[model samples]
Target: MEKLKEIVKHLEVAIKYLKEGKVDLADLVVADAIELAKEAGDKASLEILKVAHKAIDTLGREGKLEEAAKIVKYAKEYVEAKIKGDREKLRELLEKVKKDVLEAIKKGDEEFYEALVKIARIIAEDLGDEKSLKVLEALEEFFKEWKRLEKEGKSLDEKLHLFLRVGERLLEIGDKESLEMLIELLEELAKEIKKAGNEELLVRAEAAIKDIRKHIKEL
Candidate 1:
């Protein structure tokens, strides 16, 4: 585990370089850290660092210095938490990444979205929970659909249909909070569809809302 500390120090230096706007230097540091993690046979840190390297490389190339720095910071914290065997901190980091990914999706920032997904994968690996992994997989699918919809400039009704599909998957995973959030979204969509006078979509939204309410109650 002491070997993991060395990787943490390397990550800290990389973060420093990122903060100083020396992305090239930071990228080199992260690459060295990845090598060190591999040499030490620290698979978890190695995996996390590899993803960090990708994020720093791409984000740095894109001139998104702050985002690259944030990835390094997350990688460092995740390593530290692993060293301390802090599962709770790992979970917290997972939640943080999930929120970041959602925000990236909302902004239609594909670069950040891709980087966050990589980080989320490592965090979920560290957590080693089947349910979370399943949920993450489902969310990833939904995010892909979302990007496709955006690219195609689809209508709100189509987006709502995508939400219903994701809601169905979340229901299978027994994720109550996500289902509840979907209910709220569907309710809003229902209202909008009603105003738009798209009777078919409005009917579909109402039915989905009712179904989700029933499921939430059962849960």
Candidate 2:
């Protein structure tokens, strides 16, 4: 986490350079910030910094110093918010990750799925959120199923069952939001099942979705 704090300092320096019309120098600082974010093992911050780095580089070269500086400042604030344990920021980060994972699953991109699981694990540890940790466990299991499906030719039916298991875990933790996320995942899995032309698995996915929705309402 100290590394995350250092990233904030780097962003501040980048913003200072931008303010002084030293776009070249600011770009360098942002680059360093990106490296620090990676070294910190904070995927959320790393991703945000990468986006900022790209925007700053392009805007700076185009003489959009003000816009570049704004991005730097926003990146800095984002890191600071993480440092300060801002719950809303953490929730938003988790939400972004959940969406990414859903897309990864839809594409059957195992590498991307593994990356998202790692990101969620890091976030869970960094924030020490119980619900996040529980969700991370489910994600790790989901990733394992993804590997099995790739290497062992496991049926999509088994993967849909895994989603049902995760839904049950989320319900056990009593996290309504997490349960909602499971519903979205189940819906995605349903599409995959349909794509595979597995009518039985598709029916199971729909049933799982309904069960999860019922659980959420009970909360």
Candidate 3:
């Protein structure tokens, strides 16, 4: 969603300012969007990002702005380790990240600190859930395909694969932005396929489109 992208953009800005020693400039860059992100149903991700914001604040205030600026970098590494199933590296990073987050909680906003702990638990819970991890991997691959297909004109091979997977794992993992876009694209494609009189391929494609909508509604 555009709103989600906007939230990340704000994070990038804060990261930039902190790296450049613009300590005050880095402050509150993401502070404006907590409610906005929550409205977008990004509570877990946004909570983590918010913790990053506080981590930056904590470090910046202590004159560790350079390390503070590396917050996004660390987050990237954390996700990379998570995806690779490198338990040792993942544990090392997880402990460090949680340590910073917990410290931030002590000095952070009183109102949201408890919610942040719950968010941390959610992360730990996801670690034990293989189905959730599989869903996340699917979404990750879907994103790579999305970027590829959006930039290059479709080939039958790539188009068919990308089009169908657009509907897969919909109820298990949430990616409303891609789902919303892909559903629209498939609907248009189905209509054009119908106009072309390819009844054989069109019916199955139409069925896939309906399935996508059904799964989305279920979510």
- The prediction achieving the highest TM-score against the true structure is 1
Q: Give the alpha-carbon lDDT of every model.
A: 0.81, 0.71, 0.58
- Candidate 2 off by > 4 Å: 1-6, 12-31, 34-78, 82-123, 150-152, 188-203
Error of 2 at 180 (Å): 4.2
Model 2 vs truth, CA RMSD: 7.7
lDDT of 3 by residue, 1-219 (tens): 467656666666777777777777666775655555677774555666676667656756775665566565454444345435576775555455445443433333332333333334546564675543443355445555755775788744466566786466654466453366568767776776767754667777878888778877876
lDDT of 2 by residue, 46-115 (tens): 8767767776666666755765665565557668878887877866766666566666655565544554
* Candidate 1 vs. true structure, TM-score: 0.82
Better of 1 and 2 by lDDT: 1
The pairs that clash in candidate 3 are none
Candidate 2 lowest-lDDT run of ten: 110-119
Q: Distance from true position, residue 151, model 1, in Å? A: 2.0
- The order by descending TM-score is 1, 2, 3
